[PDB]
RNA sequence: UCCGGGGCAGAAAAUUGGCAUGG
RNA sequence: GACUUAAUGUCACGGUACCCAAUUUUCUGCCCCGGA
């Protein structure tokens, strides 16, 4: 008779706004969603409504199931022979049904005794309602022999509570890019998945068939189903306003974006980061200790979390970060809004009857493949911003996160049925080697092979059992010209952890299991030797979404024989995890394991089409330099107060079903892909062009355009050497030192936490990239050339790569004798009776040449030679490079509390100096040599009074701000903020010589105690406001370190322990070797760089702590110079380079370097007399410690204007080696 | 303000794009750049912009719409997108405000275009109301604004009284002959002057590219005339079809897929006109019907008929077929005793035609038939075949019976004389029908082949020594001594087929085959190593010129059941015909080996295929449907 | 008339922008 | 009950939110005169 029917969904079912049939044609969204769950507003305001399922839709699904059921059972059910039915309403006979069939109708040979009429009809006609009183126009509910009532949702009801709006896609197979898209409301299948309805049947003869059809409805409303028969946001925004206003008060408004990023990433740290105050304490903190409305930011966030504890920690952090971002955008000139000008193609889609008659006796069956998709790489399933993802809702405001990963209603990661189905369809089209681009709204079904398979294939929307927040990758685009981040190129992508396993269901309903479908399933399986190849989701080019389909277990319902048990078990729809986790014996009655799964190499479509589709090239980069892929946003959140840290991935481990305790350090697949793309576009010059439309460059075919996918897909460069290093991350300190003031600028001190890569203990980063089938021999050779270019160290990986970071040691699949006269006073004073100042000044001049023709980084220009110099550091006097990672490295603070004792700089136990220090010293020497600007300058610092430091400095001498006005030679070669440097200094590695300086005075041998190192005072250099700035500050090469050695005990006793420092110190004659790479380098530029490295036989450099004390003076020897367009340049061509650099210098002025007076002054500042001049700093007065009697060499004598005139003092400070006494 | 200067620069860019002097390829780019400037300004000012800035955004969107030429069948989604966005933005401009008149001008032109491409979204009554709003808001300035002429012509076409602006409409220099004809016909009803102006427009059509919107506009005008039962629609359709013929003779082969295939309703309209006009004059009209039918058949394929350049062009054609992006003999020349049945499936009406020429009698005559039921039965056969190859035979027989039921004239003695060899030139899905195996709707009906030795030809333009056989078996008769030196029996050596020379008088490609319903250009002959396909046949193999090719491969002559944008065959057998093969015996679907080998037995090149098919199971349609299905699959293609 | 003294410990830039369909 | 179904015809499981982008660029863990 009449029975209540419960329709339970088991994946998010599609929903669309209910429209009346005539009014439905107006809206194409509801026009398409005729098979969706209908939603009708229950009241005014478009807020709350009621969701139902059209009884005509359940009826259509039921009659389709009856068609299939009778077709399986040769046109009979329970011994009752049905006819083929009627699916053709003549227009003259009556009005057409509201829904017209556009699909093949399963038909059979008619075995009915008589034609079907009102007096008696087969159960198929009864279920169709062919000969009942009710017709195409509804009048009464009692006129239906079969009646399918509306199915009301069983659980006023708001739309956002039941459904989430989502944009789907239609991805072109040939180009890999979506042709168009459409939006549907995926409703919750857990809280709102059950729909109650009524089905009335007054013709009991068909009853059994109807019930069977109810068991055979595999899917409904876009979801697998079983058909059984019975506001803190406002307060958070206010707090964001107060926080941002307080930041604006301290002129830290721009820090609010960084703070929003940090707050969003705090969701990965849990509540404990705020309640336990796990944020960095500070050396207070530059961001977490900023005073907000009278309190520190960390305490304010603690109070906010306590007040906003109602919402979860994850939700609170995301909402606070989003509100801070939005308010920052409001205060910076409005919030950015997205608007696709032309291509925002939200596209939605001949009455004909096609009877298909399966042969009598054919066997049709159902194979349900169950498994787990393991994310072999960080997966990303794209979704629009949450504002766009609100059902029931023109500029769209860009939210905090540029790319969101689609998530379940409970924040669990989701693999959509649509995305997995599209990937399966693409792989099936590849396996067949022949498939259509899906046509929407076609009059008839696509009878192409792939479409037939897909019509026979039903998947399941899968949700991972892991709800922790996504990781964030901050991708950027590098400007090819300047090798800097492109303006506006920055976006955070939410990626799920790798190794996260999703359920996987694939039901095939058909006669014979295809060789191509089995080929695809074998393609996706990792097995033992191959790798999983299910490239689901998006960002496939950057190694996102390669899923290994493991734990594969095909089953089989023999539908012709086991149809009753199939209907009883509902095809195990919603019970597939049972099929994964149940024994072979506990299977349902009709389900038998499929033992005829063809093996991997026994499937011809797999071997011919799928196996060669993606060729994996896996290799290991050995990096003999520190590796730092910066994660500053994550650096702020976790403690240690590291300004920059190495990027580490959160990797899911299904063995423990949790994120791995130690994150895996890696160079991100985006960075790897960008390095390869830059190499290819530099060798081929493809990076040069600005437009890639209608374009077929080698880089365009290999890597893809805005309109075409990538034929090469790059995965992460995971570090496989984590266990090898005792201290994997080495804390490397850095600071910009003012070119005029020898002190450490102002706010320019910072730190870095790169992986401890060293030449003797290199980091091994094993990464792989996949090459598409059909790569040209030229393109394969070009990829090999790019890999070899990476091998030659052309492109370092990670941040600070031009300073000695991430230099590729490998991959695994000459002298000068320039004589300088020096200065008269030190040589003539053979008795060493003269005492000189420890530092002097270089007034190079007001004129500075700025090159507005900026050398590009987008190609290796042939006229400009790139290559590598090997340079031999020779220390002619003890050198000090403290390992400032541990200020208590020598462990002597027990005797002297508060003392700064550091070892010599070293990574992984081998003795080295940072390449950043080498670049800094060479850059100071180059700027002084080339008369370049004071690139680093403490303008904001004030002097004791008419104006500031910046006013005294010349306008031309100012640091180059932007490329519009050009850059000076120092900033052109070594780079600026806008422009990456074309010279890269590597970490000098110790080779041979006396390992340490040994002094018997110090109780800890090989260590030395320095004197007082105080900040230089520009007031002494600039006695009055009227007097100009002296110039670049340099130090002499003198043996004052000997004086420190003989007064070690006096220094220790007289100076307070916390005032001075102790260091592990080099000896005389120590030898290091460092590489210096260069790209697109002028001949005169290379000559000038070589001269600045090795100036002459007597000229040496100064490098390290203690330069005023005579410490840290080195000699550079170019023992080899290789170039490539790799040939070793002979010394003749090197001398030619230096000579033309001299010529360029002369042209600037308007190889004997002393001819030009400023260069002579610079080199006599670097002249090494050793002769033994005595050089030490003046004492305060005649009573201060360390005084020599009967000497005018005291600061009291040199401070007063009368005894020492200000002008004479200025001239003396500008005269190198000038006799101070 | 900054908005004023920004929008001034955008307006300057749009105006510089508007004039026809600029090249269209850069015109689109500069319109997009102007739209980018305007949209950036709109985003930076959010919802409070000057009204003229919103009007400029709408004008830019319309100018984008005007430069999106419709594709073969579907209107591009960017066209509808730009029209909708322009209408929305100009609505925002109208709500908050000689500038209002130009705002309503742009609004009305945008709505006119939207109604033309999407009539449902912009219905005719709403369009008429807004057009009246525009015209009462001053949208009348002609001779300076062509757009005002567009509103005037649309208004007169909707049926409002527009006699007041007729003089200003005609005196305007910037009015094309089609708008002039519409004005002369719709409000003044001057049929003679409308005829003169339409004749002028049709004459100008001989040079306008098929991508031009003037083609769609004139097709719409003549369609409206036909619906109006006007007396000028016949001549207009015929002359516009002559213009379409001469133009299509000089469009690019790529643009045949895109823009010439749009003007298929134009050919249907001309066919209807000539059919209405249809003793000697009547026969000339019948022959003109045949010419109209043949002009629609295999035009891009006809252009498919050094090596790397042609391979690249064929790849471009394949990408264009898949709707992808491309990166940048008279009809009376039948020989004596042969009857040619030209087919034409009119889509404007629900009828199809069967124009036939009897050479011996020199007689032309056509018969109409209803192809909707036959098309549904053919799609039934195709679906059952693609599901069950040899088990769909029954449906095939039914389809064959339908060809004898929808076309009983195929068995009329007065239509096709008995014993006359027949050359079919089918159209649309009739290309995929077994017209040779059609069963007359009579008790114990005989197939068409039995009475007439019937061969096929995709189009009449396909109609146009060595004396050794070069069989290329890749599957006994492989050791027969009649096989030539170049013949291969063990490995097909598809490269050898590429290198076959001397124009053999016959060769048999004994292998397998795949139709590739998704892409007929990769319809593959499963030869050795990589199987040779339609793409490779059109480029590599050149020896088979004047050859009599026999194709034992399965599905050699199988095409996607659904018709393309234009009527072309795209089969392996047609591929070999395109490289000069005199005749092809290609197979129309999957076949067994026994029947193919029996075909090769029939050496004996001069023997007609019909005698075979009669002898070996063809007549046994009631006896055994499978043997019928195995028999008829070998259609004969070519001209003696 | 006085005998000591640390400094910065990140600064700035970007925080998204595009997405060829007719030569 | 309606909200909310038409019934001899719903391939929307007919449609991967897809495609492009190097968290990077510059910076020597450095250094002396004054304070009441
Ligand atoms: Mg009924
Ligand atoms: Zn029945
Ligand atoms: Zn298809
Ligand atoms: Zn390019
Ligand atoms: Zn500079």
Residue numbers in the entry:
A (entry chain A): 6 to 160, 166 to 240, 268 to 320, 326 to 391, 399 to 442, 449 to 868, 899 to 1029, 1391 to 1571, ...
B (entry chain D): 15 to 111, 116 to 296, 303 to 329, 341 to 363, 391 to 526, 532 to 542, 549 to 675, 678 to 715
Q: What did the study's authors say about this model?
A:
The RNA-targeting type III-E CRISPR-gRAMP effector interacts with a caspase-like protease TPR-CHAT to form the CRISPR-guided caspase complex (Craspase), but their functional mechanism is unknown. Here, we report cryo-EM structures of the type III-E gRAMPcrRNA and gRAMPcrRNA-TPR-CHAT complexes, before and after either self or non-self RNA target binding, and elucidate the mechanisms underlying RNA-targeting and non-self RNA-induced protease activation. A recently characterized type III-E CRISPR-Cas subtype contains a single-protein effector that exhibits specific target RNA cleavage activity with no collateral activity or cell toxicity, representing a promising new tool for manipulating RNA. Lacking the type III signature protein Cas10, the III-E CRISPR loci often contain a gene encoding a caspase-like protease called TPR-CHAT that contains a caspase HetF associated with TPRs (CHAT) domain, which is a caspase family protease typically involved in programmed cell death, fused with a tetratricopeptide repeat (TPR) domain.
To determine if the TPR-CHAT protease is activated during phage infection, we investigated the conformational changes of TPR-CHAT upon binding of the invasive non-self RNA target to the gRAMPcrRNA-TPR-CHAT complex. Then, we determined a 2.9 Å cryo-EM structure of an invasive non-self RNA target-bound gRAMPcrRNA-TPR-CHAT quaternary complex. Nucleotide-1′ C was stabilized by K187Csm4 and R382Csm3.1, while the nucleotides at positions −2′ to −5′ directly interreacted with TPR-CHAT mainly through sequence-nonspecific contacts, which induced large conformational changes of the linker and the CHAT protease catalytic pocket. In particular, nucleotides −2′ A and −4′ G directly interacted with Y360 and V361 of the linker domain, inducing dramatic conformational changes of the linker domain followed by rearrangement of the H-sheet and C-helix into the extended loop structures in the CHAT protease catalytic pocket. The conformational changes in the catalytic pocket resulted in outward movement and exposure of the catalytic residues H585 and C627, which became accessible to the potential substrate peptide (in marine), compared to the structure before the non-self RNA target binding (in gray).
